[PDB]
């Protein structure tokens, strides 16, 4: 069988399962950068306010077009002069970017940008790039003060706050990131913003990996689309930080339903579900540098995700980032060394009443384990449970919650055990009262094992706490004084049947 458990057709999805959205309005915990009274399907949203307002401080994005962005001369004037030149060769673009980044002219390498333009693209593609795409990217970047007129607060640690902005505003900001115009975001030894991810794209231009051309094709697909015809929708970015976490050993909740399959993907087969991003604590991971695994791929085919890096501080253990409304612009094949851009993608997702695509993605960062046994330590298991729980919980009735679409979170490079991490997500979803749709990405044996454990536990009516106590026993009996002699799932079967 290609899938096991509850049919996926019986799982809840957006928009059909959602509650009527309240009226979109700014508030103390919701920044809204567009005119809600003029928001209409198929119309480009109007920025609010009408005239640029600047905030240059430690609570807001430092905009490149700020009159306080100085070097004293105006850095924004310098950016304008540098970018409003014909490009005909990749060195022209390098030289332009470095005119307002002089301190980094010896530090930033542009080999991948030069190789892409000169050595990957055929002549006609290169010509289209410098005659049409790059000039159009410059124009939308330089339009920033007319597009992003409202200060953008930082989603800082411990903040429970949301930003809703237009896809068009995101395009202007991402064009600026491409041209590396965001100030104070560059120095390796920075104090300010040291707890924020990279946003400027300079590391996309360095080195000779065969990955970078594929990353650039994926991003230029997006840039070509959104400069040719402005997207009309909205995107919400919500930082969520919980303080009340379950007493896992005493939770009497039953497990919820499971669909597990070794075929399909989160982004295609989990349409309308809560889609997990296997994130780095710096959201987006290496998307703007060398990474090209699950999180980076998603940030490339849905580039509006990338802008979360402009304003999202590194996630603490009790926090996540929820992004609603990003659009898929590319299709791809493979991953890492085999990742390839395939073609442009026309997103068919419905939009909700806030004109957001009905696509909800949650970034939750797993721990990186130096030693395999480290992850069975109770404090580490509880950490992962609470992280997933924070990502899944919507402080909303269970009937209005979509299923969670996820997979082997934190496995591969971070050393997580897929069978443990699957069980941890199942418990967290149960506590948040959501069903689970689990993609094993080609591993048929894992699919069978997860299904078998799930139905074993549910048929015996074990609670979340019952299972968590079994994890603690496994640690104590097979890990603390110990790889272990007995694997986790066999241990559980034996303990319960005994
Ligand atoms: C359910 N699910 C996935 O699990 C998934 N994984 C990926 S790429 C992950 C390749 N990465 C390479 C380096 C390795 C190391 O360095 O250890 C580890 C693994 N795309 C995915 N999608 C779309 C999906 O739906």
UniProtKB/Swiss-Prot annotation:
**For this UniProt entry, what's an example GO CC term?**
mitochondrial matrix
**Which residues does substrate bind?**
266-267, 280, 294, 335, 408-413
Instruction: State whether keyword Cytoplasm applies.
Output: yes
Superkingdom of the source species? Eukaryota
**GO terms of biological process kind:** ATP generation from poly-ADP-D-ribose; base-excision repair, gap-filling; carbohydrate metabolic process; nucleotide-sugar metabolic process; regulation of DNA repair
Q: What is its EC number?
A: 3.2.1.143
Phenotype for residue 413 to W: Reduced poly(ADP-ribose) glycohydrolase activity
Q: In which tissues is it expressed?
A: Ubiquitously expressed.
The GO terms this record gives for MF are: poly(ADP-ribose) glycohydrolase activity
Q: Which UniProt keywords apply?
A: Acetylation, Cytoplasm, DNA damage, Hydrolase, Mitochondrion, Nucleus, Phosphoprotein
User: Where does this protein have coiled-coil stretches?
Assistant: none
Q: How does it assemble?
A: Interacts with PCNA. Interacts with NUDT5.
Note on domains (UniProt): The PIP-box mediates interaction with PCNA and localization to replication foci.
Q: What is this protein called?
A: Poly(ADP-ribose) glycohydrolase
Q: Which organism is it from?
A: Homo sapiens
Q: What is the gene name?
A: PARG
Q: Which residues of the full protein are shown?
A: 451 to 962 of 976
